[PDB]
Design an enzyme around this catalytic site. Structure first.
Site, PDB file in Angstrom:
ATOM      1  N   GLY A 170       0.771  -1.226   0.000  1.00 32.49           N
ATOM      2  CA  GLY A 170       0.000   0.000   0.000  1.00 32.49           C
ATOM      3  C   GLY A 170       0.805   1.281   0.000  1.00 32.49           C
ATOM      4  N   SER A 171       2.061   1.236   0.440  1.00 32.81           N
ATOM      5  CA  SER A 171       2.960   2.389   0.488  1.00 32.81           C
ATOM      6  C   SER A 171       2.265   3.624   1.065  1.00 32.81           C
ATOM      7  CB  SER A 171       3.546   2.682  -0.893  1.00 32.81           C
ATOM      8  OG  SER A 171       4.561   1.748  -1.221  1.00 32.81           O
ATOM      9  N   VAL A 228       1.764  -1.415   7.219  1.00 25.88           N
ATOM     10  CA  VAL A 228       1.170  -2.729   6.985  1.00 25.88           C
ATOM     11  C   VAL A 228       2.075  -3.550   6.075  1.00 25.88           C
ATOM     12  CG1 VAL A 228      -0.830  -4.005   6.139  1.00 25.88           C
ATOM     13  CG2 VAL A 228      -1.139  -1.781   7.258  1.00 25.88           C
ATOM     14  N   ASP A 244     -11.724  -0.198   7.621  1.00 22.45           N
ATOM     15  CA  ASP A 244     -11.537   1.251   7.643  1.00 22.45           C
ATOM     16  C   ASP A 244     -10.047   1.515   7.510  1.00 22.45           C
ATOM     17  OD1 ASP A 244     -11.576   3.988   7.931  1.00 22.45           O
ATOM     18  OD2 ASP A 244     -12.786   3.999   9.749  1.00 22.45           O
TER      19      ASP A 244
END
Ligand SMILES: Nc1c(C(=O)NCc2ccc(C(=O)N[C@@H](CCC3CCCCC3)C(=O)N3CCNCC3)cc2)cnn1-c1ccccc1
Length: 336
Positions: A27-28, A34, A164
């Site tokens: 996701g950078s 993460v 979320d």
């Protein structure tokens, strides 16, 4: 028995049980800190989220506690859940980092649609799962408040989970929130589902507002100026004048906006995109709507155990929030 950890960098350092192998950032920044990993215990890929500065302040500590409490509570096929939570610390005294392990999804709902229409059958399946998860979330007196395609993730078998990743976009936000009407119910999430469902069917954003005012003007062009019944529930004269200043005509008939769509889809959209949130369909009601006939099972749409959020009203010290968090790490019980 405490597993053995190993350290790693990733410009962010990660100390995790040997159980989790082949860690790689994903996701950078969009997902936070993460990594994807291989869970050697189950042979499945997982997501590992490392919390940022979890106990730097009272607010950080309470936010850390809140997220752990929410994740530990969510036990539903269509809501993200907690597979594991761990800390390198061997004692409350050394406790300063928290890692959350969840399922790894494959794509969000922008990646599935890609500005192209989905089939009506596929829209039924996707929206059914969203509503199934919402019925569960809402039954615990939890409101998502920021439902949008980027917070909906699927795997290759089209199985969907609510999360979320978080305001970024206003395109899916209920009008009462935009108007600061103060009294919100759970159907603010149903508004968002209506916007998402319309977008899946048409391949277009329903209300692509350029700014806050434009967003409300686009909304009110479709759903109309407040009727007499809704106007009676607005205390402030200035508030009544302001909403009417952004509107003019009655609502449009959705049957002449969603040309070619399943009439059952149009009927459901009408009941989700009601301006008066007191009249907006609920998740449980929507699941029984005929649009979902081929997926609806009244006996496999479960509700949640009661969720104690009395902690939200409390003013505790930083070490108290930290200890409460530590106790929730210790008490965690993995799923099957
Ligand atoms: N990026 C990821 C992940 C991932 O980050 N997992 C870790 C991961 C941890 C946590 C969460 C998460 O949603 N946490 C909520 C609490 C639960 C909510 C579930 C719904 C109803 C309301 C409550 C929360 O408290 N916060 C704090 C404030 N800001 C937002 C988040 C998501 C995710 C898992 N899968 N993928 C993925 C990979 C490729 C493509 C698409 C998705």
């Amino acid at each position: 028995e405490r597993p053995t950890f190993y350290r790693q960098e990733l410009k962010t350092i990660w100390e995790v049980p040997e159980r989790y192998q082949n860690l790689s950032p994903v996701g950078s920044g969009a997902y936070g800190s993460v990594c994807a990993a291989f869970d050697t215990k189950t042979g499945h890929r997982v997501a590992v989220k490392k919390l940022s500065r979890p106990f730097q302040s009272i607010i950080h500590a309470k936010r850390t506690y809140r997220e752990l409490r929410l994740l530990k509570h969510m036990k539903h096929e269509n809501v993200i859940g907690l597979l594991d939570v761990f800390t390198p610390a061997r004692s409350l005294e050394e406790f300063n980092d928290v890692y959350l392990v969840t399922h790894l999804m494959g794509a969000d709902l922008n990646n599935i649609v890609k500005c192209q229409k989905l089939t009506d059958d596929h829209v039924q399946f996707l929206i059914y799962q969203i509503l199934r998860g919402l019925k569960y979330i809402h039954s615990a007196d939890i409101i998502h408040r920021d439902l949008k395609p980027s917070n909906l993730a699927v795997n290759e078998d089209c199985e969907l989970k609510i999360l979320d990743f978080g305001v970024a976009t206003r395109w899916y936000r209920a009008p009462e929130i935009m108007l600061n009407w103060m009294h919100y119910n759970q159907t603010v999430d149903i508004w968002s589902v209506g916007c998402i469902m319309a977008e899946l069917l048409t391949g277009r954003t329903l209300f692509p507002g350029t700014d806050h005012i434009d967003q409300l003007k686009l909304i009110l062009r479709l759903v109309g100026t407040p009727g007499a019944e809704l106007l009676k529930k607005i205390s402030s004269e200035s508030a009544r004048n302001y909403i009417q200043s952004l509107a003019q005509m009655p609502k449009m008939n959705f049957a002449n906006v969603f040309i070619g769509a399943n009439p059952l889809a149009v009927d459901l959209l009408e009941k989700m995109l009601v301006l008066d949130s007191d009249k907006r369909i609920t998740a449980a009601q929507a699941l029984a709507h005929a649009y979902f006939a081929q997926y609806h099972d009244p006996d496999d749409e479960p509700v949640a155990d009661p969720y104690d959020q009395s902690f939200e009203s409390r003013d505790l010290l930083i070490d108290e929030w930290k200890s409460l968090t530590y106790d929730e790490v210790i008490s965690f019980v993995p799923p099957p």
